[model samples]
Target: SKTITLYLDPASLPALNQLMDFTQNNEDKTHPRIFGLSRFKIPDNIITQYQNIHFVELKDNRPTEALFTILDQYPGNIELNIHLNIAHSVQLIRPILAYRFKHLDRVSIQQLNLYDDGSMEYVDLEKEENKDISAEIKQAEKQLSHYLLTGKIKFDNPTIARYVWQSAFPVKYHFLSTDYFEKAEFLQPLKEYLAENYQKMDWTAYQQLTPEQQAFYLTLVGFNDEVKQSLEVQQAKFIFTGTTTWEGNTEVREYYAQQQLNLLNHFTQAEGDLFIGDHYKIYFKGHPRGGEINDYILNNAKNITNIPANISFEVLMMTGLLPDKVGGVASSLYFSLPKEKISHIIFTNNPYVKVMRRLGIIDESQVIFWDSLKELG
Candidate 1:
């Protein structure tokens, strides 16, 4: 197959009219689905769109020259307006193609999105030795994290938003912050827009919320005050009990481990040194290790358990991150299940060495990953 690029300009046509024409005629770009392909299946709407699109090649290029010669003699039975963008106006042809065929196997439009995410940075509390009132407040904040999770204290939107926004961006991605909010735009207006639209909530509803729910909404924008308050108070402690870490080969193991570690290292730990932003890292760190590593981890964990006093929780199991050596053992497990429940066997790569190709799941030569799982058992 060959990819082609076609370019042309419809003569005396309003760009607005052309775009409107595409909108009315291009309903196919709306519907998409998953299918066996290099990428996700193109939506039905997208498919229908290209069907109407035509290509015009320049005479200078060899491939385009050949294509133009063929299309010139063989008239395609379609309603197309393809007029060249000439310096001087001439007799416009009956049909004009608006696109130039740039390449030959198949035409693909790669759309990319520049995600707008927020973040922050401050002095590390752990590094500060001086216990000033500000330092005490910071320490109180860490202690407050437990209450925040367990619903003991209400969190304000500014506080929660600050935490989540800071958690999302690492030190490296921190450069995206902008002072434009004050000079050109304010966060309140954007917040008000969402509040007015989706939640259909007024400022009164937001003002009445517990600070915790308010902070949660500033970032999430998912609910009304009543619903938000209920979510905060009822769910209370946001304790996430993730399950076992099914092992994987070197590449798969490292991929999952690093992403989780990166997330954990950045986000403040909520419970048991477990990071909130990621689920797997805290849940599956030991004992059920990758083959031989299990024995090694079990031995070390037993040593920790042998200490004089009884540990609050028994060391059911504990393991280290995916090791660098012997990393080729991809374990079979699913990772996207609900919180709690032990023994979630989620991992990338298929069980049994049959190349794991499936018509609906993945194609040969393409790498697929399963980042989550549910453990019913």
Candidate 2:
């Protein structure tokens, strides 16, 4: 078994690491050429890997066209494997298209679960039964993906698809990586629930590709050991991770930006002795995809420090500079980086994060809200 061409975003790249390692260790499998979305800009460290990665050329603006154009290149029966943690709609298009067309080979989604402690695992999910759920799949996809499936960005129906497609493939889950990951007995329900739901609702990705931040780390693959000295000398004492709010509407984006700025300001302007030294500064780590750091935050002369976006937090953690304190409005780092590495984590009131916590995507006990902190002054 080869890694069927993987569709990756930042959140999913870690899966690529373990995927190659898995293929190498077991069976010594050789893989077919891989594909990444257009924006990955998978620069550096990836060149000498001996794998061919052809970025998909997004030729059209229409989500429907952009999605199917690539599909058109492949035979319907070819096996497709995608790397995803949350099987949101954009991630599900190929799998759904395959299911709809009843492809001879099933589409398997590689669910890369990065745990609270930075441990990782790959769970492969595919529907092989091929039940004639065409009518059902069509209905579901039509409702959830009118924009992507039918090229109808605007339909006569007034109702916007509020909830992204609900059910994921009905199939058993198998690990592609090591067997080291298992939930506690109490988490069986969560595992099962998430299994069927595809991690998250098929929130449409609008044919645009994005990530949760590993892209930045990937840029470090070549320089992994080289940057340690630079980071050690810089001594970044604190980090404020960034996020691209799930909601992109002007209302929510603007509102969330304000809250993020407030959190940063609060973290920076607190009274004396909070930071270890005068040189000690909190760096604002922007998401590779979309963490817009506007003028107000820096223009006020907060002297917000920054590491090159390419530097890996993994290195920072090793350098003992991954923030004695890390704060964010629901940074994936909160869930991604192991808990013991950092002295503390800071969180804000992120609505989507609340949903993630409630849905068991993140462990509630591991999260530290603003209320959990003592008075900053």
Candidate 3:
């Protein structure tokens, strides 16, 4: 039975009305359920016009308490689709997944989208940018497969436990009966097949392969851009902080310039060729773009290695864009010159660095306040 594809958008009445016409005139009387696609609220009146609706698909960032309330009230065997981005943080999703759907029979999670919030604008897989993006998708799938097998969920690992929490009908309501894995129908063989066929290749082995083989391996294991070498490069650092009015105290232009100066001084030993965190450009918006800051910073320093604008802070850590276990300043230095690595990460005693430390996302080793920089031998 072909399911009705119902697109719901609060603002697009024209599209909604067009779908309504199709549903009414279609010769096939089949109406198994309505499949909804939208990132915002779906009007209840529109949904109530149809009868025997049994399925729904909520897009990325579309899961709301109200939607869950509606699903919970439905008294039939229905399918639920939790569409998500592969690298999306599980912390934001746990709330929606925590619900136990009494009548929900089959639940499928589709992790097709790569960027955060399902924004396809940032990544163009068809173009020359295919290599790294393909790598990320492959790595995410591998991790997701591993997650299914282990059944243990962690922030660093990709796993979903929400399926076990959802209750199925036809079986008596026992707490133990909710375990979905024993059925084996929901078990995806493709993940296991991928794991078996696409064993991860070592970096050395990856380099040894032909172009075709290299592309295949790159897709499976992910790729790190090779570090560039330069005699003029020095170990320097830049700390990225939020420049919002609440965070920067409305003195964004002044503080941004201060950050640039501190960044330049951190690499005082060499002539130039400094590296700055791509995020440094993003923290301050509307005042002056990062291109301007890059020009200014380059004037003071000899040159700069710009990190890709699309890379996120978490992806930066995962992809080895930054050093494995240090705060921001040390990270910039490592990027600038891997040969002459920064001895430490120096930051002003400020809220931004403090927040990073509090979240336990950054490694605190060799991290010292800016005042202590002069005392270092």
Winner by TM-score? 2
Local accuracy by lDDT, each model: 0.25, 0.41, 0.32
TM-score of each: 0.17, 0.52, 0.31
Model 3 C-alpha lDDT per residue in residues 178-203, reported as the tens digit of each score: 11212223233322322322211111
Q: For each of the candidates, give the backbone clash count.
A: 60, 4, 0
Q: RMSD in angstroms, candidate 1? A: 24.2
Which residue pairs collide, candidate 3? none
Q: What is the per-residue lDDT of model 1 for residues 1-377, given as tens digits with 9 covering 90 to 100?
A: 12222223221111111222233333354322111111112334444545423333333211233334434432333222221222111111111121223222232222111111111111111122233423343444554454433424333322222222111112111111122222222233422322312211011333444664444323221123443232233221221111224455666555544433323222223341222332222212322223333333334222111111111011111111111111111221111111133221212323222212211112354342233222111
Regions more than 4 Å wrong, model 3: 1-91, 94-248, 269-300, 311-343, 349-367, 371-377
Arranged by lDDT, best first: 2, 3, 1
Quality of model 3 by C-alpha lDDT = 0.32
Global fold similarity of model 2 (TM-score)? 0.52
Model 2 per-residue lDDT at 313: 47
Mark the 10 consecutive residues where model 2 has the least summed lDDT: 117-126
